[PDB]
Amino acid sequence: GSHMRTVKVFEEAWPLHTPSRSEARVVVVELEEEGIKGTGECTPYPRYGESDASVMAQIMSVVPQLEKGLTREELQKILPAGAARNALDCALWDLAARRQQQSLADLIGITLPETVITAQTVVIGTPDQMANSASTLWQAGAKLLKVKLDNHLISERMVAIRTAVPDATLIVDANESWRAEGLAARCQLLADLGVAMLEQPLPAQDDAALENFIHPLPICADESCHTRSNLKALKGRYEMVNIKLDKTGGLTEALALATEARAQGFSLMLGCMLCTSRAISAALPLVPQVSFADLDGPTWLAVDVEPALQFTTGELHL
């Protein structure tokens, strides 16, 4: 009635710098409230049963309701949390801000700093290789390093890295590759090296062992954390939750998750999937609430949208 809109849904596979496999697949949704366009992007999460086809179908399914004026509050009850709702929720926020000639940040009413520290990835390799990489990235300006680890050479790798960048803030993404057996001693080693945080060491569907020992360092939930709904399960297993719009299904849930998570004593982290600047921009409003920001997804793409956000080693310039 009072708000009629047009919806455009299209799929985009952006090439990556180096071998998603060779491309970041995203789904874009453009809304039009007469003259004003609202754009929302999302990245179907394979690990949660989504594909571009799967997510596009969910969006179409609600196109009719989007044209009669579906608000953000109404959208939360129609679609479940996931990439589809994320594109729509973000598209609606973009539209609601442009229709007031304001930046997403001002609409919400939060202040964005001029520079944001983003985690630089130190990929798996021999202790020596990981140490050299950490040193070079530290020299280039990265204050926060995200060390990727599997189940091998955990001690030497972390030792060689810390010795190389004694002043660097380090966080470890074990990415569900670690096991219950010996998990405590390992966390203890990360603590001996001043590791600020350990991320999702165990599989989301088998992380009970995290309640069997006093955590020597904060341990963050990633795959185990989607929406406020998991907060109960997480209590007693994790100190921090990694918030991602594709998992919360939009900025609206992300915001409520931040508030709700804090209230329960959880520390926050802001993550992202492989995406274009459009997705990072949509997440920025959360930056002032998180301990760590891992938003360099766009830098993994050969090219980005135009205009794009400015990224330098370890930094996001706003």
Q: Is 244 a catalytic residue?
A: yes
Q: Say how many CA atoms lie within 13 Å of 17 toward its Cβ.
A: 8
List residues bridging with 115 in a β-sheet.
Answer: 317
| Residue 49: alpha-carbon gap to chain centroid | 18
What gap in Å lies between CA 162 and CA 127, rounded to an integer?
A: 11
Per the CB < 8 A criterion, the answer to whether 159 and 142 are in contact is no
Per the CB < 8 A criterion, the answer to whether 198 and 213 are in contact is no
Experimental method: X-ray
Of the residues 77, 148, 232, 247, only one is catalytic, namely 148
Bond into 216 cis (ω within 30): no
Task: Summarize the annotated binding site for substrate as residue ranges.
Answer: 121, 146, 272, 294, 296
What gap in Å lies between CA 250 and CA 289, rounded to an integer?
A: 17
Count CB atoms within 10 A of the CB of residue 179: 14
Tokens of 95: 């539209």
Cβ-count burial of 169 within 10 angstroms (0-12 exposed, 13-18 middle, 19+ buried)?
Answer: middle
* Dihedral sign from CA coordinates of 255, 256, 262, 268: negative
125, 288, 277, 267: which is closest to 196 by C-alpha?
267
Contacts of 265 (CB under 8 A, 6+ apart): none
List residues bridging with 298 in a β-sheet.
Answer: none
Task: Summarize the annotated binding site for Mg(2+) as residue ranges.
Answer: 173, 199, 222
| Residue 88: alpha-carbon gap to chain centroid | 17
Give whole-number Cα distances, 131 to 127, 173, 198, 308, in Å: 6, 16, 18, 31
* Residue pointed to by tokens 């590791």: 195
What gap in Å lies between CA 258 and CA 79, rounded to an integer?
A: 20
Helix or strand or coil: residue 300?
helix
Helix or strand or coil: residue 299?
helix
Contacts of 79 (CB under 8 A, 6+ apart): 58, 61, 62, 85, 88, 249
Of the residues 8, 77, 244, 247, only one is catalytic, namely 244
Per the CB < 8 A criterion, the answer to whether 272 and 241 are in contact is no
* Residue pointed to by tokens 């920025």: 284
Q: Which helix (H) or strand (E) holds 158?
A: helix 154-164
Domains for the chain: give ranges and CATH numbers.
2-100 (3.30.390.10), 112-318 (3.20.20.120)
Q: Is 77 a catalytic residue?
A: no
